[PDB]
Ligand binder design. Sequence first.
Ligand SMILES: Cc1cc2nc3c(=O)[nH]c(=O)nc-3n(C[C@H](O)[C@H](O)[C@H](O)COP(=O)(O)OP(=O)(O)OC[C@H]3O[C@@H](n4cnc5c(N)ncnc54)[C@H](O)[C@@H]3O)c2cc1C
Length: 455
Amino acid sequence: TPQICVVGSGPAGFYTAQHLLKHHSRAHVDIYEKQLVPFGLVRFGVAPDHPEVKNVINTFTQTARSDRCAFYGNVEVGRDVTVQELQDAYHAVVLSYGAEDHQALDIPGEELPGVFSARAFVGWYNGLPENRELAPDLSCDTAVILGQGNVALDVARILLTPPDHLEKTDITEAALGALRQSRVKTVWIVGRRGPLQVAFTIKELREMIQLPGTRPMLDPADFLGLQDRIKEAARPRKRLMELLLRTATEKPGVEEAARRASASRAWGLRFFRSPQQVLPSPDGRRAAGIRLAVTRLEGIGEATRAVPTGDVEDLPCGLVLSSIGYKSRPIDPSVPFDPKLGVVPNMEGRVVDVPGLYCSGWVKRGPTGVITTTMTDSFLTGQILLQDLKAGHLPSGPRPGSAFIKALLDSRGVWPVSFSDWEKLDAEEVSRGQASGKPREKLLDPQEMLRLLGH
Ligand SMILES: Cc1cc2nc3c(=O)[nH]c(=O)nc-3n(C[C@H](O)[C@H](O)[C@H](O)COP(=O)(O)OP(=O)(O)OC[C@H]3O[C@@H](n4cnc5c(N)ncnc54)[C@H](O)[C@@H]3O)c2cc1C
């Protein structure tokens, strides 16, 4: 019986195991995860008001219920067990542990209270234990988000949705209460390039424009010559661009003009501005604005690079959210790493110079794909791995798998969480969300979670 194992239980991992299980009748797959619960960013990243995006959990679960698959929660690879150990124990090892860091802003004042990375702000509301005590000061009246992608859109939306519309989501009870007292009435999504280079997608952009109680603030001037450049543009790009174009230059209607008129909150899109410095409040105890450098685009097409003009702009705010870039981290000494592209060097999923060591998901291609890309691309990694297996390019005969690895964990006093254990944790989250109308009220304390399991 071939023994394969994966590191990370997000889409990369589950989808790679899914393929392995479907295309190899007797292989056994073990999924190691550092958090106590599986699913990674489907649970800690996808916003709470996008439950439909989280329905892939339904396919993760049927994969995890195969009699040849087992989940190992609460096992931090590169600390509880090394990659080499995993490598000696199994015939193949798949690195799929995402891209955990965020790229720092690297600008003076980035330390000031009120400056957060967008991904941490999402973990706060998404119940990722390490962000539980993030306690953001939502008492200011404005928030600036650096970077124009969906993550930026996601936090903007959550800071402006009227709290009652969030009430039946799976957002944490604690974050909900923070939003209820929030005084944040305006959200600027600042980018350094232009409308052509925003990275968001149409489903999010239109949810932003139709978000009850809010009114968009686009400057007509940013969209000059827009309709002329997108003339040749493919459907996706063009539709998006006309949606931005239309919202920026057309007069609305009598009902939509009126709705915008009475909206208490607002959100805009700023362009050709790059983060230069976080501005201090008079007393130095918090952020009170951000110093932006004016930029001008040069070069053609997909190769346009902003260049400073020399001009700067001070933009007041009491919250600076950075969402410009996630990067993988080197997990074990023995694992190759490309610090530039924050990825583990590989050739279609085969790690550079280390037989039996594969990769998939963000750690394989960079932090760009959405779940479907990650989905399909992960099946490509499973294809290679099983081809190498079939060609006999993995060690032969017999490997112990979990039998060996379980021993090491036991001896180190690491208590692994099985799939069943997660099912017991799931039940409790559901039961405690019933009283308040929610799909679940997430468990934030690992000790508490371990004790409900009997440890
Ligand atoms: C805020 C946000 C919102 C998003 N919204 C959407 C959306 O709406 N739709 C969409 O299609 N995509 C969305 N995405 C993109 C999607 O989240 C990614 O495509 C996808 O989850 C990346 O999959 P992954 O399996 O590589 O990594 P991840 O999902 O990050 O997870 C990999 C797993 O590895 C585990 N792990 C990490 N280190 C270790 C270790 N040392 N030992 C053991 N286990 C470890 C992590 O805990 C994690 O569970 C969003 C991303 C973000 C950040």
